[PDB]
Task: structure prediction
Amino acid sequence: CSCKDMTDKECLYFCHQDVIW
Result:
């Protein structure tokens, strides 16, 4: 992913927010 003008924790909540629970 790309976190440009963001952090990590937040960034993930946009790109790594692929939960199928």
